[PDB]
Design a protein around this ligand. Structure first.
Ligand SMILES: NC(=O)C1=CN([C@@H]2O[C@H](COP(=O)(O)OP(=O)(O)OC[C@H]3O[C@@H](n4cnc5c(N)ncnc54)[C@H](OP(=O)(O)O)[C@@H]3O)[C@@H](O)[C@H]2O)C=CC1
Ligand SMILES: NC(=O)C1=CN([C@@H]2O[C@H](COP(=O)(O)OP(=O)(O)OC[C@H]3O[C@@H](n4cnc5c(N)ncnc54)[C@H](OP(=O)(O)O)[C@@H]3O)[C@@H](O)[C@H]2O)C=CC1
Ligand SMILES: Cc1cc(-c2cnc([C@H](C)Nc3nccc(N4C(=O)OC[C@@H]4C(C)C)n3)nc2)ccc1F
Ligand SMILES: Cc1cc(-c2cnc([C@H](C)Nc3nccc(N4C(=O)OC[C@@H]4C(C)C)n3)nc2)ccc1F
Lengths: 408, 401
């Protein structure tokens, strides 16, 4: 009866998202899909006990099965250690996975006709790809010479570059780098994303300023395009072009959306996440780690565990947490699984669940944050929204009807 | 009798803005104000004829007289070298001026109650200043090996060597960048001076959680300069200074109503995408608190100038160019304690906002309310009709006194 799903590496998480995650599987995934699930408990109470081995095991499993779906997890800080009696302030589970699997992170917001966009003209989502987190910075305490050097590993002559001669007083200095392989893995991930979506791709740099550094990004993309993708792109009526960041900002805002934007100097936490957080649309933002093979993906919600809401849930208070970015972690993983397995039944299910989600909201049934995008952050009434469990139920009902009406 | 405006440095420019700049002086400035006008022609052909000496002299004149008002200018590229048969690709005049004067550029959008904002909650303008990557040393790493950054103090008692990266698999790129304390101090002074001038609070944003040393130094110097030199001046005006992590600042700004100064350590391209470039001012604030260079945030508007050249009707927004004059004249009035000039510069800003708020505007403003496809010929005024309208309204405002 159920749809064959195939091999999927699941990762359980923490707090409010963990609550939502189970509701998704129980009400939206499992009644219709039978999966070869390879579940890992990346909850903090199990990550500490297993000495963050569950995190390492989860990562190797995604490499093996090619499809990973991750719940949001608590990234440990000093204050969290007192709450769980933590044996160590462990690494970020996402940092660990990214270091193991590699690849480019692509962000995408979920668009609904009745939910205003920051730029009203955006009817189709904009997808942003990006690799200062690698920088080595320090204080210069007084006069002296700061130099940056390259020492070949083969014993040949080191090359010296003067950064600055501080004649009077001190200041600050830093060194940054990028590996050709990382730039190549980013070009491949971006060209494959544009083909898998049927949208054009743009790369933005400041190669007029950082002529060598950014010039290398522009040349690598172009080299990979012309030799491995130009024909495949031209046979989909789409394209690839390099843009200076200034022209790209303006172009993006005058656009209708529906393009891929490979952004070199990009701070996703700020330019996407913080803007989304301030706009009140974090619950509608998705993230997908796309490895250079074109086979390995790890899909997740761009947001965190939603701690504030989880506390109200513990304190017996009613919550209205948006589950869409969480559902879309599942739908994006299942869509990629279907692509690999040539599974038309699974490809349809992933498509139908995304549509039910968009359609329910468009029909007037939504969580508090979505109601706030319409009415204004402080202007929501209880009658404007459905709570966490109420919304999941409405999605469930609409998913049933939609799947029954599709046979014909 | 006309107002005695005093010493003002003016820089004439290029293409569409040159046409607007001359209309502003003839129609809005010269009928009410007399100036001891130090006028420099930064038109591309004059910069070429003088080997860019006019640009350096204009900057020297701003330093001497403290007030500069600048028209947009062509920055030569390959296509411009050919178009004007230039002796060489002359450097940006703005770069030359900024290099000679020093200081921080603050951008500010002009708000009208009938004109939609990107974030509707912003009912008051946000003033943004960036620290100004351009003094970096970047290179290509040909293959495996170590990239290290070293500091050697002048005495020679020490040497610290930091690993940037040990390239183990192939090549890539690397770069080194720096900031002198003086440059950070100057940025703090301009920022505190801007906040004191507007009577608005100031926020410094950095990524000090990641660049703990590099950005922590910006955080430390701003706090130290504030505590010793500005804290009492801020308390007297009931304003405040605070540091913010960039992530929190962006979220906070999105939820804000505006009316603050934002010193950014990491707008006009956002204004261009939005279709509001003609409503954005730009002001270079020197750390001395005496020298100011005011201009529109936009360029010469070449696309519109080609239309004007071909007889075709143009609807170029002149407000940002007007606000370059009002801002410079208001600073001149403050340095000289000239109530009449202060009154004039403020009234010209009010007239501008009132005219737009009464439904008399340019195509870009009409497109902001309605959207460019739905814009009908009658929804907007052309450059010249709009300038005449502002002129009529200015005469009335000034007559009612
Ligand atoms: N990939 C991952 O695993 C990530 C994990 N985290 C972790 O999550 C924890 C909490 O982080 P925090 O800074 O609060 O970031 P969150 O994204 O969890 O929450 C930030 C705020 O944005 C709003 N928001 C986010 N998602 C939703 C949603 N689905 N529905 C409704 N509103 C939403 C809420 O606003 P309001 O409070 O106004 O309701 C929320 O408190 C930390 O322990 C952190 O380590 C953080 C980022 C990523
Ligand atoms: N400070 C300075 O002196 C600056 C000079 N420049 C110079 O200006 C020239 C033109 O550059 P360009 O890239 O076109 O940048 P511009 O800012 O001159 O124009 C870009 C576009 O923005 C819109 N726009 C800008 N100003 C106005 C206005 N006042 N009213 C209505 N719309 C406006 C128009 O859009 P639309 O086409 O959709 O109508 C315009 O074509 C170049 O030679 C460049 O070097 C550039 C920036 C600053
Ligand atoms: C101009 C410009 C844009 C962006 C940018 C950032 N993040 C996205 C996300 C991944 N996708 C998307 N797609 C459609 C709508 C939409 N959003 C929306 O309406 O409000 C909320 C959210 C975003 C503004 C966060 N977000 N797109 C573009 C980045 C730099 C820039 F300079
Ligand atoms: C956090 C954040 C901030 C900013 C931003 C950019 N530029 C400014 C300028 C200097 N001032 C100002 N002030 C009030 C309104 C306002 N504008 C407005 O509403 O539409 C037109 C114009 C600008 C968006 C061009 N512009 N302010 C804020 C942008 C995105 C963000 F995500």
């Amino acid at each position: 009866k159920k749809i064959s799903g195939g091999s999927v590496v699941e990762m359980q998480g923490d707090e409010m998202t963990r609550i939502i995650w189970e509701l998704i599987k129980e009400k939206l995934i499992f009644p219709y899909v039978e999966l070869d699930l390879h579940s890992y408990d990346l909850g903090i109470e199990n990550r500490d006990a297993t000495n963050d081995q569950v995190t390492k095991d989860a990562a190797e499993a995604i490499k093996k099965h090619n499809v990973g779906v991750k719940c949001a997890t608590i990234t440990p800080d000093e204050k969290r250690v007192e709450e769980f009696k933590l044996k160590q302030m462990w690494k970020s589970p996402n940092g660990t996975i990214r270091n193991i699997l590699g690849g480019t992170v692509f962000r995408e917001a979920i668009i609904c006709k009745n939910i205003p966009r920051l730029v009203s003209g955006w009817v189709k989502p904009i997808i942003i790809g990006h690799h200062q987190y690698r920088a080595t910075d320090f204080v210069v305490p007084g006069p002296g010479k700061v130099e940056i050097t390259y020492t070949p590993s083969d014993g040949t002559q080191k090359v010296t570059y003067l950064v600055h001669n501080f004649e009077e007083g001190g200041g600050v200095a830093m060194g940054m780098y990028n590996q050709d392989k990382s730039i190549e893995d980013f070009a491949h991930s971006s060209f494959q994303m544009a083909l898998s979506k049927g949208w054009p791709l743009y790369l933005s740099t400041k190669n007029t300023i950082l002529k060598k550094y950014d010039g290398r990004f522009k040349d690598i993309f172009q080299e990979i395009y012309d030799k491995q993708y130009k024909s495949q792109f031209e046979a989909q009526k789409i394209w690839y072009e390099h843009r200076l960041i200034d022209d790209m900002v303006a172009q993006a805002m005058k656009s209708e959306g529906g393009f891929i934007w490979a952004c070199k100097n990009y701070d996703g936490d700020v330019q996407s996440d913080s803007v989304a957080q301030g706009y009140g649309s974090l619950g509608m933002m998705t993230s997908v780690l796309v490895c250079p093979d074109g086979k390995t993906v790890e899909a997740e919600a761009a947001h965190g565990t939603v701690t504030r809401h989880y506390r109200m849930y513990q304190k017996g208070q009613e919550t209205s947490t948006n589950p869409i970015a969480s559902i879309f972690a599942w739908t994006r993983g299942l869509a990629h699984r279907a692509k690999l397995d040539n599974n038309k039944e699974l490809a349809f299910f992933a498509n139908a669940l995304e549509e039910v989600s968009i359609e329910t909201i468009e029909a007037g049934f939504m969580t508090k944050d979505l109601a706030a995008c319409i009415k204004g952050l402080p202007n929501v009434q209880r009658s404007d929204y459905l709570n966490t469990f109420e919304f999941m139920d409405k999605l469930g009902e609409n998913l049933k009807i939609k799947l029954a009406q599709a046979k014909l």
